[PDB]
Design a protein around this nucleic acid. Structure first.
Length: 49
DNA sequence: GTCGTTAGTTGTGGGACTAAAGGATATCGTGAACCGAAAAATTAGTGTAACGGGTATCCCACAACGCTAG
């Protein structure tokens, strides 16, 4: 079996606004109670969070 | 000359907009006629009184002694 070394992802630091950071929290209950409830609940249901 | 690509618009669509109290509204337009459904009202029909013993209970009153002789 021939294998190759795994390639690590590359990324850059990014400054995010407070609204986007609040809306991108790992808890869908917290995000759904701030803004865009339909969108957060949709993504949470499709992804099964 | 011609076809796919990339970046910068441009128009269009979806999503935010303190906290406390309070918190009353007015709401058109009309086509007919018959049948069925069930909910309601009206009508038609039958009846006791004391007695025998014997005994369960009630109220209501009274008793539940003292002395002498063989």
């Amino acid at each position: 079996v021939t294998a190759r070394d795994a390639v690590a992802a590359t990324a850059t630091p990014i400054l995010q606004g407070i609204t986007r950071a609040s809306l991108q929290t790992k808890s869908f209950i917290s995000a759904a109670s701030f803004q865009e409830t339909t969108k957060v609940l949709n993504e949470a249901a499709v992804n099964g969070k």
